[PDB]
Each structure stands twice: as structure tokens, then as C-alpha cells.
């Protein structure tokens, strides 16, 4: 029967017994992530130089063409393409497709589909396991950030040639140009982002150290204390009342969590919200609502500008501005 | 530059592409420089200069009216770039012009709102599933599903 | 590319010496009486 054979397939797709869960989101995730990974690996090793800025000035990204791990990248599609979709079959040849940065588009579009399905797949398995459903809400923060730099920013600026370049030094290039063109350091959503990752690292170390500090003695002086916990044991492995007694004295009593559910909600919420704001920073500077501009904000009684540290930032921004893409501008304003 | 005597059709820019005019990847005549990416743009002040092949060099040489020069100067100087405190211009601009485009205000606000509403969709969709199935308050200790599953390995 | 000629031996020993240390410790743990 068709209905039985299809139901057998549905049961296998959604099975809680597969070593790696597949699921319906996984039916999309698996082919798209495989296509993106295979293309990325081949391009990172072997792709010829790519004319990222559409000025017939090809940038070499691959290892075989003179890069190391730190300088290699998969280079964005050409500025001549802009936001046009550039699949392989629209090129006259693979040679043309490679010159124009075809691999980048294939990789980023399959990757983005893949991570959105990865997020849905986190919802799906939690449903199959009888868990609560909000782990994908936490993962939506890195997903939103990846989508900001690979999709929203190029849309706002009119070209995938301005999206994040897929390499270590390419990432730094994206960041430095971004600072000149948006003053992202002076944007409060990036500031919230920094509080998110500085605070997330701080709270990770804090939480890690407090639980580690109050582990109950269950091991001898020889073995690792890790053997004092057995996977799946019912009893808690540390004395949370001892941990709270330390931390409440370190600061003051009411500044400390005694409710482990509140504590772990806070650990989730702080970095997640911080990265949501980081992603919204990129996604709104994508439409050129930029960081605070206090250039020449302080003026003396006669009218002379009295510089502030904001003005010193501006001098660095100008140095980046005038140098970046040094052959690409013919007219006096960089308007995208 | 054409008013100064430049032959804008034959002017080669530093890269070898036309400084003012070049071809799109399918051959249409378009504006050069970084704005090569924006050749899909269409607007009433520009279309009188466009023909079947793209921008028409004869119309460019002979038929640009003052109202088009005015509109292009106005729009170049009201580009939708500006700071959060509404200082108009590129990020390196000095204070003077109090400007952020309505297009930037409307695009940014509605991206922020659309994004959190997608988060709200995920939140309430996941919760509605878990509540309909009866485990939105947590795992039943006496009936934990994973404890009834075969180990993965 | 004109890379440093000692980069290859540096990388090889950087990988090999600590990896081998860990493999030695792992295998002799497995072989201990259970």
C-alpha cells in the first residue's frame, strides 16, 4: 500500500532511534548543508581568484593560489552581479562562474537554508522527546547574526559583494570597512552585543566556578573529581546552598540566585538577547541608520571645534574610508 | 564633467571600465563606478535617458534637462545614510545637516519588529505544540519518555 | 610561496609530539584490568 509505505517512511524520518535525528526539517537541512560544505571546502582549497568588486581586479582566496589558513577565503560574488541570483546554469562556463564569485552564492544560500532548518530541527526533536520547546529560540540569536551579515546587509547595500567574506582575514576586512561606513562601535546595539558576549563569558565563568566550588566530596585524593558524578543519578552533585552562601557574601545576599531555574533562565537570556541586539545592529545599519555621530559636537566660545575621543575615532574611520577598495570609487561619496 | 567637455562615452576609468558608463553583465549601458550594482534602478528623472540598449549616449549628450540635473543633485545629497542622532551623511561626516531619510526610519523599525515577531512565532508555536501534547510544564518524572527509549549506542 | 623552511617540521612536531603523548596514555588506560 502507498499509505503504509509512506507511513513507514514518515516513522523512520521522525524516529527517535536514529543516532542523528533526521526529521522533516532534516530532510531540507541535510542536502543543503552537504552542498554548502562540499562547495566551501573545494573552493577554499582550489578556487581561482574572484573579482569581488566588479572592477576586473580578482582577489585570490584559495590555498592553492597563494593563501594560508589565516588569509584564505571564499570570495563574494562580483559587484557587477549585485543582488542578482547567479547559479551555475546562468554562467557561460564554470570558468566564468568562478571568475565572478559563483561559489560564494551557492555556499551562502545553501548554508542559510541549512541553519534555519537546523533551528527548526531543534524544535522538532524536543517535541519528539517530550521536552520544552525553546532551545531553538536561543539558537535564533546566532542564526539572526549569520543572516544579518550574509543576507540582510548585502540586500540593504544592493550587493552580495558587500556581504561577509568567508574567511578569517576576510572577516576582519568586513569588520574594518563596516566601522568606517557605519561607526558600528558607536552604535548602541553593538554595545549591547558586546555586553552580551562579555557578560556571557563572565557568567559562564561565574556559574562554572560556583558549581565547581561546591561539589560534594565523592572521590578520593587520586581520581578526578569528575568521577564523583554518575550520568543520570537522581541527586544533585553540588551544594547549591553552599554556593549561594558564598556568592551572597561575595556581593550581597539578595544579589545572588538561590533558584536554579531563575539562574539558568538568566544564563540563557543575557547572551541571547545581547546577540539579538547585535544582529539587529547589523540588520539596521544595513539600511544606513548608523552609530552615534558626535563629530565636532564640542565647540568653544569662538566656534573652534574642541576634539573629543569621538573625533579621534572619526580620523581612524576616514583613514579606512579613503583606502578601502582603492580602485572602485570614481565619485566623491561612498553611498553604498 | 560633460559640461566641462568630457566625452563620457569614451572615458576609460582607472580600472579599464568606463568612468561614467559601462555595460551590465547582459550588455545594457549603465552608470559606472560602484553604482554598477544599482543598474536595476528605475525612476522618472532617469528613464527619459534610457533606450532599448540602456542609457542612450545621444540623449545623454543632448537631452538632459535642468530639472533632471536638479533632481539628481537633490537625490545625491539626500541619500538614505545618517547617524542614530540624525546627523546626515556618511559616518565620517561632520555635524551640520539634521537628516535621516524616512526610508531608513521605516526600513529599520520594521526589520526590528519583523525579527522579534518571528521570535514570537517560534516561542508561541513551540509552546502551543508542547501545551497541546501536555508537557509545556516539564517532563513527568514518573514517565520520562527518553527513559523508555533504547540507548543510542 | 616563499615560506619558512622550518615551518613544515615545526608543524609536524607540534602535532605529533603531544598527540602521541595522549595516544600513549589512552591505550595504556584501555589495557588496564577492568
Amino acid at each position: 500500500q502507498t499509505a503504509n509505505l509512506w507511513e513507514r517512511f514518515c516513522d523512520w524520518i521522525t524516529s527517535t532511534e536514529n543516532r542523528l535525528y533526521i526529521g522533516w526539517f532534516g530532510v531540507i537541512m541535510i542536502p543543503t548543508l552537504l552542498a554548502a560544505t562540499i562547495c566551501f571546502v573545494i573552493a577554499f582549497i582550489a578556487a581561482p581568484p574572484v573579482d569581488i568588486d566588479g572592477i576586473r581586479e580578482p582577489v585570490s582566496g584559495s590555498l592553492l593560489y597563494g593563501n594560508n589558513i589565516i588569509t584564505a577565503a571564499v570570495v563574494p560574488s562580483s559587484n557587477a552581479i549585485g543582488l542578482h541570483l547567479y547559479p551555475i546554469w546562468d554562467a557561460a562556463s564554470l570558468d566564468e562562474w568562478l571568475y565572478n564569485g559563483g561559489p560564494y552564492q551557492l555556499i551562502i544560500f545553501h548554508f542559510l537554508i541549512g541553519i534555519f532548518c537546523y533551528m527548526g530541527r531543534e524544535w522538532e526533536l524536543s517535541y519528539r522527546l517530550g521536552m520544552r520547546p525553546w532551545i531553538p529560540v536561543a539558537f535564533s540569536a546566532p542564526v539572526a547574526a549569520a543572516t544579518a551579515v550574509l543576507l540582510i546587509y548585502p540586500i540593504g547595500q544592493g550587493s552580495f559583494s558587500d556581504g561577509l567574506m568567508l574567511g578569517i582575514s576576510g572577516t576582519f576586512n568586513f569588520m574594518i570597512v563596516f566601522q568606517a561606513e557605519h561607526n558600528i562601535l558607536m552604535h548602541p546595539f553593538h554595545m549591547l552585543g558586546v555586553a552580551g558576549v562579555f557578560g556571557g563569558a563572565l557568567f559562564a565563568a561565574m556559574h562554572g566556578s560556583l558549581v565547581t566550588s561546591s561539589l560534594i566530596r565523592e572521590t578520593t585524593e587520586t581520581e578526578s573529581t569528575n568521577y564523583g558524578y554518575k550520568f543520570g543519578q537522581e541527586e544533585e552533585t553540588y551544594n547549591i546552598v553552599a554556593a549561594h552562601g558564598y556568592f551572597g557574601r561575595l556581593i550581597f545576599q539578595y544579589a545572588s540566585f538561590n533558584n536554579s531555574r531563575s539562574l539558568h533562565f538568566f544564563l540563557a537570556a543575557w547572551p541571547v538577547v545581547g546577540i539579538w541586539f547585535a544582529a539587529l545592529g547589523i540588520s539596521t545599519m544595513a539600511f544606513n541608520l548608523n552609530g552615534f555621530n558626535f563629530n565636532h559636537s564640542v565647540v568653544d566660545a569662538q566656534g573652534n571645534v574642541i576634539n573629543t575621543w569621538a573625533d579621534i575615532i572619526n580620523r581612524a574611520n576616514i583613514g579606512i574610508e579613503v583606502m578601502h577598495e582603492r580602485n572602485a570609487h570614481n565619485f566623491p561619496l561612498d553611498l553604498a | 564633467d560633460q559640461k566641462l567637455g568630457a566625452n563620457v562615452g569614451s572615458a576609460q576609468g582607472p580600472t579599464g571600465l568606463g568612468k561614467y558608463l559601462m555595460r551590465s553583465p547582459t550588455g545594457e549601458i549603465i552608470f559606472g563606478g560602484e553604482t554598477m550594482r544599482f543598474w536595476d534602478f528605475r525612476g522618472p528623472w532617469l528613464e527619459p535617458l534610457r533606450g532599448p540598449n540602456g542609457l542612450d549616449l545621444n540623449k545623454i549628450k543632448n537631452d538632459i534637462q535642468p530639472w533632471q540635473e536638479r533632481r539628481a543633485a537633490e537625490y545625491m545629497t539626500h541619500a538614505p545614510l545618517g547617524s542614530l542622532n540624525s546627523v546626515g551623511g556618511v559616518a565620517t561626516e561632520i555635524n551640520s545637516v539634521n537628516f535621516v531619510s524616512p526610508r531608513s526610519w521605516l526600513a529599520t523599525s520594521h526589520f526590528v519588529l519583523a525579527f522579534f515577531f518571528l521570535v514570537g512565532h517560534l516561542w508561541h508555536a513551540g509552546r502551543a505544540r508542547a501545551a497541546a501534547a501536555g508537557f509545556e510544564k516539564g517532563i513527568d518524572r514518573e514517565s520520562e519518555p527518553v527513559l523508555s527509549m533504547p540507548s543510542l549506542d | 610561496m616563499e615560506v619558512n623552511q622550518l615551518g613544515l617540521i615545526a608543524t609536524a612536531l607540534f602535532v605529533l609530539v603531544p598527540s602521541v603523548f595522549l595516544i600513549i596514555l589512552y591505550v595504556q588506560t584501555e589495557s588496564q584490568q577492568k
Binding site: L20, I45, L63, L64, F231, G232 | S151 | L8, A12, V15
Partner: peptide
């Protein structure tokens, strides 16, 4: 020789992923 070195290390990492997942110490309730 440097490209070989980089690709070799990468390949060893991917192999490690495979063993870390499919040949892990099985988690066991006791």
C-alpha cells in the same frame, strides 16, 4: 607543501569528528 599541511590537519579534524560521534564512550546510566 604548505597547502598539503593545512589540508592534512583539516582532514585529521574531520576524521576526529567522525570517531568522536560514532565511536564515543557510550553514555550509561548506573
Amino acid at each position: 607543501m604548505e597547502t598539503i599541511t593545512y589540508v592534512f590537519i583539516f582532514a585529521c579534524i574531520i576524521a576526529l569528528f567522525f570517531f568522536a560521534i560514532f565511536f564515543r564512550e557510550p553514555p550509561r546510566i548506573t
